[PDB]
C-alpha cells in the first residue's frame, strides 16, 4: 500500500500516510413517538345501521393517527380499490382531511362507485369526480340488512324506489355496504397521516440513528445535562447536534463523533527490510480492527516498546520515535542529548591548551526554474 | 466534502487530484512546525546542570531556574507564562517535542550560560566564576572592569530588583494569543461553511438525496461540491500564507538565541 | 395612554437546548424601548404581524382573546376563552357581538350567537405576558406568568417567554379583540417586526439577557 | 458584486461568509501598514532640535 | 449543446491553472528569502570576518 501510494517500487526511509481507518456501523435503529389517537374507524366500519344510497353519510375524519393497514389486510372486504394512490403507501403519507362516505347498495352496483361511470347510482345518487384520490371499500352484508318479507327501508333515487331485500336473493342482489375514503389536500399546514414505528435504542456503539427526524451517526451515551422541558436536542458552538432527548423515555443522551483517523506506515526502507509498523492516528487502540502499544499520537502496531533512549530516527510524535534496531521496530522517548557536568566553583577556571581547525559546509537555494504557460493553448 | 454519502464520492472522483494537493499542502505545514521548534530550542549538545550550591557572586537566579517540586519542572516565570495563554474530517496532531522537553532544553541553555559564559556555544563548556564573567562582559561594552568589582553588591542588587519587577509586570502575551485566535477563528469558518446550500435546494446531502431521483439530484450535489471545495481551497491558501509568517518569526528567534544567549551582541 | 417597554417580549425562537452562548438570531421581535398602547377597564385592534400582550391583576378580568379577519360569519375565526373552569379553544364560523364579553348567579357569555361549521374544538398581583404569531397555517402562542409586586402597572426587567401551543389551523388573521368579565355583583398591545437579537444563554439553557442590535451604535 | 440590488444580495447570502472573510483579510493588511511605519520612524523618544 | 459541456471543462482547467499560479507565488517568496540570506552570508562571511 505504501508502494502504491508513492507510485514506486523502492521506498526510502520515512513515514508515510497510506490510508484511513473508519469503524463500521451495523443496523439502523429508527426511534419515534408512541401513538394515542390512532383513529377509531370502528364507528364507520362498525356501525349497527348504515345510511341510504340517496342520502349518503359524510364523516370528516380529522387530525388523528390513521392506520390503513388494519383496513388493507383485514381480508373481510370484498372490494378494496385505491385510485390516487396504491394501498400499501397509505401508512406513509399525510394529508389535510380525510372524508368517509357511507351507504348501502345492491351487489352488482359496486362497479359504478368509481371515477367515470354511468348508471342510476352514479348518475343521480352519488357521483365521484374524475380525478379521485381516495379508496373505495365494500363488503357483503346480507345477514344484517336483508330480512324475510323484504327490507323496504333502503331507497334510491331513480322519484324514490326501494330495494326490497330478501335473504333468499342471488348474489348481486344482496345488500353490500360501501365506504368511500377521499383524501383531500387543501392548503393548510398539515393534518392526519400514517403511523410511525420505532426500533430499539442501544448505547456505546457507533450506530446509525433517527430521532423523530434527526438523522445521524455516532455513539450514544447517557448524559448528565438538563434540558428545559420543551427542548428536544442540543447544539454546540459551530452548530453541530451533540445531545438528543429520547421521545419515549425522555432522557438526554450525548452523541459523540464515531472514532476515525489517518493510517501511517513506518518502514526502515525496502533496501533494509520489508517489515512494517502501522500507526492509527489518535485512535484508541482497543477499536482498531503481537505488539500493540498506545501513544499520545495513536495506536502503534508492529513495534515493541523498549526502555532505552536513543537519538530520534523516525519521528512518531509526542516525544516518541521508532527505529529498526532490536531485526525489527521499536518505540521509546527520544534523547535530548548527552549530559555534561561543569565543575563550577567560586574560584576555578578552565583554559584551553590546544585548538583544532575545522571546516563545515552550508547549502542554500538561490533560484528555481523559470516556467511560462500559454493560457489559451492549455 | 462528501461526508459519508456515496453519491458524492463518485462525483468528486471526477475532479482529478484536487484533494491530493490539499493534503500535501497541509502536511508540509505540519512538518515545518516541528523544524521551527528544533531550530529554536535544540541548540545545545549536552544537557547541562547547575551545581547544588548557588554561590554566584550575590546574583540570584532562583525565579528562572527549574522548580524541582513539580511534574513539569518549569521555573516560576515559566509557570506564570503558561497560565496566561472531533469533527467532519478535522484532526489536530500533537507536537513531536513535549513541553517538558522544551523546558528541559531551556534550563540547560540557562545552566550553560550561568556556568560557562559563552564558551559552551563555541565548543566545550569552560567554567569561570560568575563575577569574572560579568567583568569580561563589562569590557565588551567598553567599561573598565574594576567598575564591576568595586560595585559588585550594588550591581547584584539592581539585577535582583529588576528580575523581581518582571513577575509583577507579568502576574504582554498578546502576540502569542493572536496566533491561537486567528487559527481557531479560521477553523470555525470552515465548519460553518458546511451549512450553506450554495444555490442548491438544501445543504444536507441526505435530504437532497431522498427527495429527488439521481438525474435530478446530481445537479444539486455538484453545486454543493463546488462550494465546499472552494471553501477548503480558501482555508488551505491562507494557512500557507500564515505559516510563512510564523517561519520568519522562528528564524528571528533562532538568531536571537544564537547571538544574544550564546554570546554578547 | 402610551407607555414604554424596556426589555420585554423575548421568546425562545425554538426547541433545541443551549447553554452559555451569545447566540444571534433573526426573527420577529418586539423592539426594545417601544411605544406600547395602554388600555384601561375593548376595541377591535389590528394584527398585521404578531402581537405582544401583557396584563395585570389578582382577579381574572382578562378572559381570552378572539381573532380573525372579520370576526363574524362568512369567514372563519379562532376563539380562545376561559370561564371559571378552564381554557376553551375553538374554531368555527361565529357571529360575534360587536361588544362581546362575559358576566359575573355568575352567568355570562354574551360573546357570540353562532357556532357553525366548527373545524377544531378543545375543552378541559400578577403579570401575564403572551406572544401570538401566525406562520404557515400554524398559530403559535408563547407565554409567561411572572408575579409583580405592584397591582396594575407595567414593570421593568427581563423574562423570556416559553412556547405553549401550536395549532395547524390554516386560518387567515387580520384583527383581534379581548374579553372581560363585567361588574354585576389594564393591558398593553405591542407589535412585532423583523429584528436581529443577541441572546445570552445560561448554563441551564435559559435566556438571561439580550441585546437589540439596532437600537444604538453601542448595540 | 451586486451594487445596490436586493435581488442579487439575497442570492449572495447562499454562499455564507465569503464577504466577511474578504473584508477581514483586507482590513488586517491595512492595519499592518501603520505598524510598518511606526516601526521604522518612531524609534526616538524625544523630539531633538 | 456542446457549449454546456465545453464550459464545464473551461471552468475546471481555469481553476487548476490558477491554483498552480498561486502555489508558485508562495514558493517563490520562500526562495527569495533564502537567496537574501545567501547574499548576506557572501558579504559577511566571505568578504569579511564575522
Ligand atoms: C369491527 O369490530 C370488530 C369487533 O371488535 C372487529 O372484528 C375483529 O376482527 C379481528 C380481525 O379480523 C378478529 O381477530 C377479531 O376476532 C374480531 N372481533 C371479534 C370480537 O371477534 C373488526 O375488525 C372491526 N372492524 C374494523 C374495520 O376495524
Ligand atoms: C410510550 O409507551 C411506553 C409503553 O408502550 C411507555 O413506557 C412506560 O413507561 C412507564 C414509566 O413511567 C413504565 O412504568 C411503564 O411500564 C412503561 N410501559 C412499558 C410497556 O414498558 C412510555 O412511557 C410512553 N411514552 C411516554 C412519553 O410516556
Ligand atoms: C595539539 O594537538 C595536535 C593534534 O591536533 C598535536 O599534534 C599531534 O601529535 C601527535 C603525537 O605527537 C601526532 O601523532 C599527530 O600527528 C599530531 N598531529 C598533527 C596534525 O600534526 C599536538 O602535539 C598538540 N600540542 C600539544 C602542546 O599538546
Ligand atoms: C532569591 O530571591 C527570592 C525572591 O524572589 C528569595 O526568596 C524569597 O526570600 C524572601 C526573604 O528574602 C522570603 O520572604 C520569600 O518568601 C522568598 N520567596 C520564595 C522562597 O519563594 C530567595 O531567598 C533569593 N535567594 C537567595 C539565595 O537569597
Ligand atoms: C541499498 O542497496 C545497496 C545495494 O543493494 C547497498 O549498497 C546500500 O548499502 C543500501 N542502502 C542502505 C541504506 O541499506
Ligand atoms: C481506551 O478505552 C479504554 C476503555 O474505556 C480506556 O480505559 C482507555 O483509557 C482508552 N484509551 C485512552 C488513551 O484513554
Ligand atoms: C521499563 O521500566 C519500568 C520502570 O518503572 C518497568 O516497570 C517496566 O517493566 C520496564 N519495561 C520493560 C519493557 O522492561
Ligand atoms: C407613541 O406614538 C404616539 C403617536 O402620536 C406619540 O404621540 C407618543 O408620544 C409616542 N410615545 C412615546 C413614548 O414615544
Ligand atoms: C366553560 O365554557 C365552555 C365553552 O363552551 C363550556 O363548554 C363549558 O361547559 C363551560 N363550563 C361549564 C362548567 O359549563
Ligand atoms: C358552512 O355553513 C354554511 C351555513 O351553515 C353552509 O351553507 C356551508 O355548507 C358550511 N360549509 C361547509 C363546508 O359545509
Ligand atoms: C388570506 O388572504 C389573502 C388575501 O390577500 C388570500 O390571498 C389568501 O389566499 C388567504 N389565505 C388562504 C390560506 O387562503
Ligand atoms: C440552574 O442554574 C443555577 C445558576 O445558574 C445553578 O446554580 C443550578 O445548579 C442550575 N440547575 C438547577 C437549578 O437545576
PDB file of N, CA, C and O in Angstrom, chain A residues 104-107 145-152 154 162-167 169 173-176:
ATOM      1  N   UNK A 104     -75.384   2.001   1.341  1.00  0.00           N
ATOM      2  CA  UNK A 104     -75.733   0.610   1.076  1.00  0.00           C
ATOM      3  C   UNK A 104     -76.345   0.506  -0.311  1.00  0.00           C
ATOM      4  O   UNK A 104     -77.292   1.228  -0.617  1.00  0.00           O
ATOM      5  N   UNK A 105     -75.842  -0.411  -1.129  1.00  0.00           N
ATOM      6  CA  UNK A 105     -76.342  -0.585  -2.483  1.00  0.00           C
ATOM      7  C   UNK A 105     -76.525  -2.065  -2.767  1.00  0.00           C
ATOM      8  O   UNK A 105     -76.340  -2.908  -1.903  1.00  0.00           O
ATOM      9  N   UNK A 106     -76.877  -2.385  -4.007  1.00  0.00           N
ATOM     10  CA  UNK A 106     -77.043  -3.775  -4.385  1.00  0.00           C
ATOM     11  C   UNK A 106     -75.647  -4.364  -4.508  1.00  0.00           C
ATOM     12  O   UNK A 106     -74.661  -3.685  -4.231  1.00  0.00           O
ATOM     13  N   UNK A 107     -75.551  -5.620  -4.924  1.00  0.00           N
ATOM     14  CA  UNK A 107     -74.267  -6.259  -5.063  1.00  0.00           C
ATOM     15  C   UNK A 107     -73.574  -5.911  -6.354  1.00  0.00           C
ATOM     16  O   UNK A 107     -72.351  -5.767  -6.381  1.00  0.00           O
ATOM     17  N   UNK A 145     -78.732  -6.665   6.741  1.00  0.00           N
ATOM     18  CA  UNK A 145     -79.619  -5.692   6.133  1.00  0.00           C
ATOM     19  C   UNK A 145     -80.815  -6.308   5.443  1.00  0.00           C
ATOM     20  O   UNK A 145     -81.780  -5.598   5.165  1.00  0.00           O
ATOM     21  N   UNK A 146     -80.791  -7.596   5.163  1.00  0.00           N
ATOM     22  CA  UNK A 146     -81.882  -8.238   4.460  1.00  0.00           C
ATOM     23  C   UNK A 146     -82.727  -9.029   5.433  1.00  0.00           C
ATOM     24  O   UNK A 146     -82.206  -9.796   6.238  1.00  0.00           O
ATOM     25  N   UNK A 147     -84.039  -8.848   5.359  1.00  0.00           N
ATOM     26  CA  UNK A 147     -84.912  -9.505   6.312  1.00  0.00           C
ATOM     27  C   UNK A 147     -86.081 -10.136   5.579  1.00  0.00           C
ATOM     28  O   UNK A 147     -86.564  -9.616   4.576  1.00  0.00           O
ATOM     29  N   UNK A 148     -86.518 -11.284   6.096  1.00  0.00           N
ATOM     30  CA  UNK A 148     -87.586 -12.047   5.465  1.00  0.00           C
ATOM     31  C   UNK A 148     -88.813 -11.170   5.306  1.00  0.00           C
ATOM     32  O   UNK A 148     -89.161 -10.392   6.202  1.00  0.00           O
ATOM     33  N   UNK A 149     -89.467 -11.278   4.163  1.00  0.00           N
ATOM     34  CA  UNK A 149     -90.558 -10.411   3.822  1.00  0.00           C
ATOM     35  C   UNK A 149     -90.135  -9.147   3.114  1.00  0.00           C
ATOM     36  O   UNK A 149     -90.993  -8.419   2.612  1.00  0.00           O
ATOM     37  N   UNK A 150     -88.844  -8.863   3.078  1.00  0.00           N
ATOM     38  CA  UNK A 150     -88.370  -7.718   2.341  1.00  0.00           C
ATOM     39  C   UNK A 150     -88.093  -6.520   3.209  1.00  0.00           C
ATOM     40  O   UNK A 150     -88.975  -6.044   3.920  1.00  0.00           O
ATOM     41  N   UNK A 151     -86.876  -6.018   3.155  1.00  0.00           N
ATOM     42  CA  UNK A 151     -86.487  -4.835   3.906  1.00  0.00           C
ATOM     43  C   UNK A 151     -86.697  -3.637   3.001  1.00  0.00           C
ATOM     44  O   UNK A 151     -85.853  -3.330   2.166  1.00  0.00           O
ATOM     45  N   UNK A 152     -87.819  -2.947   3.176  1.00  0.00           N
ATOM     46  CA  UNK A 152     -88.176  -1.823   2.326  1.00  0.00           C
ATOM     47  C   UNK A 152     -87.741  -0.488   2.896  1.00  0.00           C
ATOM     48  O   UNK A 152     -88.387   0.525   2.632  1.00  0.00           O
ATOM     49  N   UNK A 154     -84.527   0.715   2.473  1.00  0.00           N
ATOM     50  CA  UNK A 154     -83.341   1.149   1.754  1.00  0.00           C
ATOM     51  C   UNK A 154     -83.764   1.617   0.371  1.00  0.00           C
ATOM     52  O   UNK A 154     -84.004   0.797  -0.516  1.00  0.00           O
ATOM     53  N   UNK A 162     -87.505   1.538  -3.675  1.00  0.00           N
ATOM     54  CA  UNK A 162     -86.902   0.848  -2.546  1.00  0.00           C
ATOM     55  C   UNK A 162     -86.466  -0.538  -2.961  1.00  0.00           C
ATOM     56  O   UNK A 162     -87.254  -1.297  -3.531  1.00  0.00           O
ATOM     57  N   UNK A 163     -85.215  -0.868  -2.680  1.00  0.00           N
ATOM     58  CA  UNK A 163     -84.746  -2.238  -2.757  1.00  0.00           C
ATOM     59  C   UNK A 163     -85.595  -3.057  -1.808  1.00  0.00           C
ATOM     60  O   UNK A 163     -85.659  -2.756  -0.618  1.00  0.00           O
ATOM     61  N   UNK A 164     -86.258  -4.084  -2.295  1.00  0.00           N
ATOM     62  CA  UNK A 164     -86.834  -4.974  -1.320  1.00  0.00           C
ATOM     63  C   UNK A 164     -85.891  -6.120  -1.100  1.00  0.00           C
ATOM     64  O   UNK A 164     -85.961  -7.120  -1.810  1.00  0.00           O
ATOM     65  N   UNK A 165     -85.026  -6.017  -0.107  1.00  0.00           N
ATOM     66  CA  UNK A 165     -84.006  -7.029   0.081  1.00  0.00           C
ATOM     67  C   UNK A 165     -84.605  -8.229   0.783  1.00  0.00           C
ATOM     68  O   UNK A 165     -85.406  -8.085   1.703  1.00  0.00           O
ATOM     69  N   UNK A 166     -84.224  -9.413   0.347  1.00  0.00           N
ATOM     70  CA  UNK A 166     -84.715 -10.617   0.974  1.00  0.00           C
ATOM     71  C   UNK A 166     -83.590 -11.623   1.078  1.00  0.00           C
ATOM     72  O   UNK A 166     -82.730 -11.681   0.202  1.00  0.00           O
ATOM     73  N   UNK A 167     -83.556 -12.421   2.140  1.00  0.00           N
ATOM     74  CA  UNK A 167     -82.374 -13.245   2.385  1.00  0.00           C
ATOM     75  C   UNK A 167     -82.159 -14.318   1.349  1.00  0.00           C
ATOM     76  O   UNK A 167     -81.029 -14.792   1.206  1.00  0.00           O
ATOM     77  N   UNK A 169     -81.938 -14.094  -1.889  1.00  0.00           N
ATOM     78  CA  UNK A 169     -81.628 -13.443  -3.149  1.00  0.00           C
ATOM     79  C   UNK A 169     -80.278 -13.920  -3.646  1.00  0.00           C
ATOM     80  O   UNK A 169     -79.329 -14.050  -2.874  1.00  0.00           O
ATOM     81  N   UNK A 173     -77.811  -9.439  -5.890  1.00  0.00           N
ATOM     82  CA  UNK A 173     -78.987  -8.749  -5.403  1.00  0.00           C
ATOM     83  C   UNK A 173     -79.010  -8.649  -3.898  1.00  0.00           C
ATOM     84  O   UNK A 173     -80.020  -8.208  -3.347  1.00  0.00           O
ATOM     85  N   UNK A 174     -77.976  -9.053  -3.229  1.00  0.00           N
ATOM     86  CA  UNK A 174     -77.911  -8.913  -1.795  1.00  0.00           C
ATOM     87  C   UNK A 174     -77.227  -7.610  -1.434  1.00  0.00           C
ATOM     88  O   UNK A 174     -76.429  -7.092  -2.209  1.00  0.00           O
ATOM     89  N   UNK A 175     -77.519  -7.056  -0.274  1.00  0.00           N
ATOM     90  CA  UNK A 175     -77.022  -5.723   0.038  1.00  0.00           C
ATOM     91  C   UNK A 175     -75.542  -5.720   0.328  1.00  0.00           C
ATOM     92  O   UNK A 175     -75.022  -6.579   1.034  1.00  0.00           O
ATOM     93  N   UNK A 176     -74.860  -4.718  -0.202  1.00  0.00           N
ATOM     94  CA  UNK A 176     -73.441  -4.522   0.049  1.00  0.00           C
ATOM     95  C   UNK A 176     -73.303  -3.189   0.744  1.00  0.00           C
ATOM     96  O   UNK A 176     -73.983  -2.232   0.370  1.00  0.00           O
TER      97      UNK A 176
END
